Symmetry: C2
């Protein structure tokens, strides 16, 4: 940076602390990643200055010729990545992407069927303190109490009992492949739309490592910042038949001016995702998650669902008589960043929990591989088996430092 | 830029076109401005990588120590700028800022009283194709048919008849000072909350050039990108008594992860606004708008309300037998960017209109002053009085080029 250090010493000092933090810690938050310098440059561009309500070639402001090129690059690259008929790259966030789909097809108080929030569902899939659960009547399907895999007979029974207008598939914390074909079959049986929120797995879908929901869903939502490794924001994919309605839901429905600089950054990220090296990266994410899962099991940890098919895993800490809160805190002390996370049928509140959620997207981006996964698992074992030993924690600290350099 | 040109030639070429465009044109879109290089650098930072749901010291992710410093800088500087008891700097946009306030105090179908959209009100103040008009029962107050000033007796009568739960004051296209004291008096009479949407005038308020709504309103919303000259985004100000409720409305209510890099950019912009030179800038914006208004009148144009008290003006093109659409198109041909805009009691649709909206915030930022205002007015006169003369339009083109260099 050149201008920020002089203009704002306070903001610059904090940014620099954060930059150094991102390098020093082992970042295992499943929803996080590290964007490229090109992506950041796009976000840091003069495109922030441009009002561009509307869509390419159909704006409500003059002078949009060039931001139009940018938005269309984003849309076309998204379509190439996911084989979707239509893309809307304007959503400010995952929240807004989901909000727009709900706004498109639902009226206030309509019934929606989503994944149980304490089994892996997201806040925006029906929490009673979120717009989703306040505006619409959410009911939930669960995972099997033993396998922790989605119970598709429960999906079906809930759908048939409650007659939802919309079924939501996808998750904030589900370590296995989701069967989109079965979701569409059930949706078809009850005459419900299917929305798939692929936010977590979007990069894996792009790389052909998770089945693509696009052929099965009426609407696919996603964030651009998780496994897709793009800027912070949202996106909606759908078939041409819903294009007009979806676009109108975003504007003038729920948003105003789009963030054109962020949309530029989305285009850049989609460009990166179209490259061969991204597919290799995504495979390493999945390989690393499996290896980390296996290595954690070797250390004596129980994993929700017994492993992983994707970028993320959940440790069930009950055998160690630890809460997720306790584990999260102590791992923070040694420089490993995880989330506490409810496990299916958790006896604890969502504020305490019996689990931790871990993902490999970020560490993979920094070049970590199988050997590093083994070491991460060994450090976690050292820490969680010796929470009362300051000597053990200092050893862990030193081993974390050795990994990050 | 260093990395974007190599990584993405297509995105870079379009960004560069846009950058050159912003320099070449006379940008009179009233809601636009040019942010500093420091603001852009903040947006282009690694803060995009950080999940930080929650608030400073009360997050749902570890490792937020530094993004917390950034968010608190934004909040504290906002409070200093506006004398508010509480700030929420997380809203992704003006849309989301307004959405959150509505979510806080209203239930589905509650009555809200806002400014007539064709008299200056914003889309989010009750359009039937916007969430505001779909989710809530909006009624409207108008301006006087002759003076084009808000009719406060109409505000009062509508309030007393319809018994709104909430009254919204502020505008996308109102060229005069708004009397917030009278709005609060009326709100008090009918037991309604008062929300002021100061998006357009926020920079003028910060500089003491428009009365501050903070002392009078329960909630103040704003965008950060108009006269405040900051990054694209929103903000909510309120008294401490509503702080918890407002914060909960933003998260977990209507948003997820905040855009921490944009929040950094907000802090930077607020830092800039706290400087003496910003107050001088804001006075020039207002001085320039008055001078441009006067100069347009000298050219024979009629202005809505007969002039301006702020950064923006509206030309009533009926005396020239022109529509706003026609004027917008022809001005585009010579390199002047304006919006078509409805005038109060417009005989034309919002898609055609009888007016153009002009603002001086952007040209003032680039260093334009009174002499430039005279020339802009003269060029507009030349163009709009000779729409059929290609020679006149080429002269205008050359004069526009002379202004921008």
């Amino acid at each position: 940076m050149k201008y920020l250090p002089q203009q704002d010493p306070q903001v610059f000092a904090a940014i620099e602390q954060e930059r150094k933090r991102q390098h020093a810690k082992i970042e295992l938050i499943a929803s996080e990643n590290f964007v490229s310098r090109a992506v950041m440059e796009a976000q840091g561009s003069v495109l922030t200055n441009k009002y561009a309500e509307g869509y390419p070639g159909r704006r409500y402001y003059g002078g949009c010729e060039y931001v139009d090129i940018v938005e269309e690059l984003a849309r076309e690259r998204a379509k190439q990545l996911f084989g979707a008929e239509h893309a809307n790259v304007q959503p400010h966030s995952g929240a807004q992407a989901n909000m727009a789909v709900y706004f498109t097809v639902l009226e206030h108080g309509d019934t929606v069927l989503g994944m149980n929030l304490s089994h892996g569902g997201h806040l925006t899939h029906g929490s009673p303190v979120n717009f989703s659960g306040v505006q619409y009547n959410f009911v939930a399907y669960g995972v099997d109490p033993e396998t922790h895999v989605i119970d598709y007979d429960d999906v079906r029974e809930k759908a048939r009992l409650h007659r939802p207008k919309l079924i939501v598939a996808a998750a904030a914390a589900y370590p296995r492949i989701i069967d989109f074909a079965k979701f569409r079959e059930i949706a078809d049986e009850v005459g419900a739309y299917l929305m798939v929120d692929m936010a977590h797995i979007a990069g894996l879908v792009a790389a052909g490592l998770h089945p693509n929901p696009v052929p099965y869903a009426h609407f696919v939502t996603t964030t651009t910042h998780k496994t897709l490794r793009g800027p912070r924001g949202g996106m909606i994919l759908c078939q041409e038949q819903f294009a007009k309605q979806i676009d109108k839901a975003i504007f003038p429905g729920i948003q105003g001016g789009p963030l054109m600089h962020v949309i530029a950054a989305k285009a850049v990220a989609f460009g990166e995702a179209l490259q061969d090296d991204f597919k290799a990266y995504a495979k390493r994410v999945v390989d690393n998650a499996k290896r980390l899962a296996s290595a954690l099991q070797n250390e004596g940890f129980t994993l929700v669902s017994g492993g992983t098919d994707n970028h993320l895993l959940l440790v069930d800490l009950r055998p160690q008589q630890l809460t997720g809160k306790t584990a999260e805190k102590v791992l923070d002390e040694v420089g490993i960043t995880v989330n506490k996370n409810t496990i299916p049928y958790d006896p604890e509140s969502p504020f305490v929990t019996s689990g931790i959620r871990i993902g490999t997207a970020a560490v993979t981006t920094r070049g970590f591989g199988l050997e590093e996964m083994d070491e991460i698992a060994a450090i976690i074992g050292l820490v969680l088996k010796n929470v009362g030993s300051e000597q053990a924690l200092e050893e862990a600290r030193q081993r974390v430092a050795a990994l990050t350099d």
